[PDB]
Amino acid sequence: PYYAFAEPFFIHAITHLHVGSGSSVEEEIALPFQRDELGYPTIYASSLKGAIKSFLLKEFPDKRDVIYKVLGEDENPEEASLGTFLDAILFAIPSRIIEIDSAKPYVWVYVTTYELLKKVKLYLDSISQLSNASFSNLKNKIDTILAKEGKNITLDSDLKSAILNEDFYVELEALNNKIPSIINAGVPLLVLEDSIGREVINRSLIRVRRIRIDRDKKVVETGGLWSEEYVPMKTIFFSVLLGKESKESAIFASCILRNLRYVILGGKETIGKGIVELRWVKDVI
Amino acid sequence: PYYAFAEPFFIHAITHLHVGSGSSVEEEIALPFQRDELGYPTIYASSLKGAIKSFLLKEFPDKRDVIYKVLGEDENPEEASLGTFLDAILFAIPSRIIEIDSAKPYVWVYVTTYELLKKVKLYLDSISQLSNASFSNLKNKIDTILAKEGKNITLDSDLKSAILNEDFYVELEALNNKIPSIINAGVPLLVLEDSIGREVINRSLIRVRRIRIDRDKKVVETGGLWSEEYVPMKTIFFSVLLGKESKESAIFASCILRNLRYVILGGKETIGKGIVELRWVKD
Amino acid sequence: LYEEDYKLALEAFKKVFNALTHYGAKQAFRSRARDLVEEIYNSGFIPTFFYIISKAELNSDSLDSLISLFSSDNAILRGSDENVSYSAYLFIILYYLIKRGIIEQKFLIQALRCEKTRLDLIDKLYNLAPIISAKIRTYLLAIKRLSEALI
Amino acid sequence: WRKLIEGLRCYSERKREDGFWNLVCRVLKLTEDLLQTTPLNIRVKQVSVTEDEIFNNNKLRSDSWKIYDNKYRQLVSEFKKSKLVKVTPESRLKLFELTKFDKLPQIGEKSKRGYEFCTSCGVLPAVVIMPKEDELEKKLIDLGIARDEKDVRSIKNMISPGERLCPWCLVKRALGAEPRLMRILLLGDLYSVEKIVNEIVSRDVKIEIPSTSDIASIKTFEEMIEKKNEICEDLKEEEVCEKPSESVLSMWQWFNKNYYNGINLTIDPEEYWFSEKRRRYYFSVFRRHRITFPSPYYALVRADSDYLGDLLEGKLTPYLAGIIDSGDYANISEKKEEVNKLLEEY
Amino acid sequence: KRVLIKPLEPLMFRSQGEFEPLITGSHTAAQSLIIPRPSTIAGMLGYILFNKSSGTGDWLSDLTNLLATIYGTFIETNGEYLFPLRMGNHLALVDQQHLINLPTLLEKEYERREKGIYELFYDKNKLFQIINHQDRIGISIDKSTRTVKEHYLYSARYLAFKKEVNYVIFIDNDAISDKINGKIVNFGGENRIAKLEVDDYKVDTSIEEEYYLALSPILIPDEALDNFLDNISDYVAMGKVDKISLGFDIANTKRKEMLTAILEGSIVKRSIIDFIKNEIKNDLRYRFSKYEKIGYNTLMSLCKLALRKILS
Amino acid sequence: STQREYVFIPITNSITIDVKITIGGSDHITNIDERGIHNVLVITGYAVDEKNGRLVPTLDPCDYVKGILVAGTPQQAQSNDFLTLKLPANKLYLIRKKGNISDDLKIYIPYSSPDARNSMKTKPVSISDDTIVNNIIKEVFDKIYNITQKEKVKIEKVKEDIKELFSYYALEQ
């Protein structure tokens, strides 16, 4: 076992979150979200680590040595950290839906694509070998979903037709109507093909015009106007926390990581962006 | 004898990678990748061997003597290692595709140039009819592709046209009719003209800014801002391990190299920037 | 690949700064600059194009008070609210489209001369919208940054 | 050269103690026939001129005024031509038998690969080999480097553990110990080679030449001396903020103007805050005082004048650098314009 | 007859002495030789042809017990041929043609000659179009901190070829040719790899022009040293004279012998040739015979591909 | 056996005609095959007269003339001034050796005697100004060599080597 513990977890957005991109890329949005190699939104584990560490150093002010051991000293480091954060893959994004023939309609649904599921399966298979942690449940469920690759499917529910994000009509197949929820929520999961999924997911993102106003004359100050990209509430990212054998890692994996449920990610937190909930996979499967 | 047998293998990036080189280029990045002579991302053989040796020492602590023999010894290093790695050369990089045609949906595609394939063929020709392991089909495929140098070629596809990395229109053309895929990931490969291919590639790399925040007043410390460059996930490199005839080299190839899928390359591992899957060209 | 677009903007633009005077529909051009760009890739090229031609005054005034730019000089484009200050933008996009061989002049000049061929001009732009959107991106961000700096 | 090396031998024999001087004595006697050669060759060119060239048998001549501008150019021409072959001062030595047949004096350790290379020189074989920093005394004494425990501290003071030295670079170290032997050469012809050794062994003076560690740590030192005791009370113990014991001075003007300012500037930063056993303690000490922890970098600033050779040759490439190439003088008939302009102006 | 050495990756032919973390508070560095010394090619070929029952003393004895008169190395890119050229501190690659007017160029008068040679080394030089130093910084990592060891950092200026480059030697015996065909070898320092392909060729030998190009370091027998370093103008027109070491012997793990030499790319005046033969003793002639077998005294002339030994 | 011809190549288009008919002879030694202008030759000690197009020698290896070896007889109305000699092909100093050596060589050389009247300021000059150089294709490289633009879609690289593989010291007066 290269890694002592393997802690895959979900990242349920509680509010809209905004992890900013670092890039000399000129984009349209003044402040875009972080992007993976497929243009999907992601959270660089640099940002996960920085935020979760800044949070832990305050929630547990006594165990700062365990934290400094698992996540590295700050100002004068003598050693490599023992814990690793993997980059957060997008896993499911919420999209407004309009249905044709339901019994009790839905107004929003969870949207994932097959490429995201393939990245998640990569993570799981990679970590099943660098650890003693065999995630049979996630892996077999995601394999059954990936069997149907190349055909939009509703995982559980029976929709057969929808209009996602007010623009995209989609036909849908039941997976088998015989597969549990990947996460035990009340909303169906739509696994879309990738070409339509890209557009749907780009529609689910939230671009927001913002301004600055002269306090004197209640008019927009010159230059004070920019756009700004958010990820919606209820968005689910996926990541893994990984650590090596230290006896500060057994503590971390048993005291610190059982009292993490809510953290503030990204920025724009003075305006409520960032509150997020961690859902350790070992629990939510 | 004297590099009798060789093992070429693909280095498939499971996460992003950052094999660092200090500030070793003239770009705007402050922590660039390790660069080829052509400015392409490469993995030096020193780094590849050091990482693989460290990983194998950890996860085969009883085979420490076999690993020491094949890859070198810390002290008493008066015993030449009977195994060696070539520089890992970029074989294919994923690119975002806005395709116009083919009726087949694709959102990312593998991209190469002909310089890359030229160096891959250089590695490949220097083994097959010289060593004894026989995988001539891959070399024939690369030669068939290299025939068409000087025009954006699509491989195993019906694309005929695409926007690559949101910024470059290219017009493609199939090779002859059909060909076995060089990779086994069911995604099209495109070999591009060595001039537009490198713009597409250097736009496929991830160049992020990073920040050190003042731990109390949640602001950036002065000068706590820099740039780094990651090779994207799903990127493929290519290298060869050359073995000199010996007994414990057979132990290496049998017990060890047959249980190496995942290793950790490069640095910034706490960010998660090193996981790699090694696929041997033996399947 | 795109390094002469910055050179193309000078003699395409030719005036969207000075002779756009009175600072209303002169400065307003920057709204074009930023918004349209975010509009062109979040929402698509053809929606933004339909919006732009909507604001066009395509009689002959906003059909020749621009095709005069192909030939002679700076065209003070006062006219009215952003319909002549808007047909210069239609001119900008179509100027990139002619100077880069995505659509030729002999069609464009002919497409905007019968009102029978405007329709299939647009119907052809609709098919070139992916390629067009990809290609003009830097050429547009050029004038968007021009606006940030100068306009 | 040989006067300097022999005066060095005598000054070192005047100090058979102190370990380092004793090791220098011990290896000088083994390398004389190798140290005979100067470590720095010179090129000498002359040019002649006679009265056939200057005088009309009673007076000056016309085109005699230009005779200098011609002979100077002849001289520089032969200098340029002879600079087409560079011979290195190491190629002069006879080492074939000394390396093929083990003849080299290997006072110090012994190589397991024939001979070692000088760490300071790179090309010449090493005479004085220093064991690596894992256990020195238990080796420095059973080998021939030192004699006691007291003399290691003075050998270890100049030759770091692991430093292999060739005879020339070892002589360089020796001269660096006290750089007052230079008066053997600086004066010459004026005093004996022994007057000077007596003068130096009489008025003992030690000099502190700054290492790159001292230059990198300049602002750190400077920011410790504006907290003279306010930082000293914290340590008060490790001689950083302790008395100037001797009257050591140096040529480094900043070191010389800042010595009697509380902090001992003759500490090695490689010992205190560039060390691997310390520097965490020192990170804490600097954190507790608003001391910007030092960077390990210094600036090596070199500068050379532009076309001063051509300028002494009265050329115009100094005046128009890039416009008029030096190769443009071979047939200056081409660029008549710029030369005409600027020369006429002048 | 001709053996093309094809490097598969950047190479390192170390120019200096010690490359290892000896001192604690200092990094180590290295710079690659542009052309591998003939001892490198010789030892490589011998490694390919090793025997376990010969020599063990004076390596060139049982090294030459396997070789032919190897003729010095130059650069072929794509059938094109480049040849070294050396000045005071300078080293330039040039092709066959640019060497013709070189004898008369160095006797052109002051300004014409300096402009000529200066254009030969900054406009005609094709080195930095085909070969550039690729600085590779490496470290060692202590497995307790997973960090760098103390100052265990090193630079190594490798040899990166921007296009296809071969190293060209000529070898006499053909039984050697068809036993080292297609061999992947460890050509150079720090474990780099190159391939060997052999093709029979034909180039003439017996030529005596006024001048010569040294395609290999001309070794000076250390008894002619003072008889050589007083009158340097008699034997070399331009180039570099340097102390070198013959390398490092593998069977005995020792550093080889340091000799004065005339580095390759230096132009030697024919006066050199007999000057060697007439100033060497038979017992040293026997040693330098082998020194030439491995390829150290190789001369090409500036007119044709004029391969020539010195003693032989 | 055949006979060859070393036609000059100055800045001038005085190289439109040297031989009567297109090709003539059986075999050629200089080759244009996909990667270089092979087996070219550079004569030294001479110089080119760009106007009054012939050779105007100037004896030093500093000076040189670069010409191609084609198989043809010189215009049938001269060779009163054109050298016609014969060498064993290993005194034939060919640049970029690729092909076959014939060992019985016969050459015609466009040349006029020096006829010394002017101070021969003999100045070198590049082969550039692409407007000058591009029209040269099918009258210096396809008037005697139909072989190109027959199989070759590789003209611009054997143009890259045209940009340098010719050089001389002209007359200018």
Ligand SMILES: Nc1ncnc2c1ncn2[C@@H]1O[C@H](COP(=O)(O)OP(=O)(O)NP(=O)(O)O)[C@@H](O)[C@H]1O
């Ligand atoms: N005529 C001269 N008298 C004295 N010193 C000279 C003379 N010419 C050159 N030097 C020095 O000798 C060295 C010659 O190097 P060099 O670089 O060629 O000189 P330079 O004139 O400065 N050429 P450059 O520096 O490239 O502009 C330098 O240290 C010069 O300062």
Ligand SMILES: [Mn+2]
């Ligand atoms: Mn100078």
Ligand SMILES: [Zn+2]
């Ligand atoms: Zn030295």
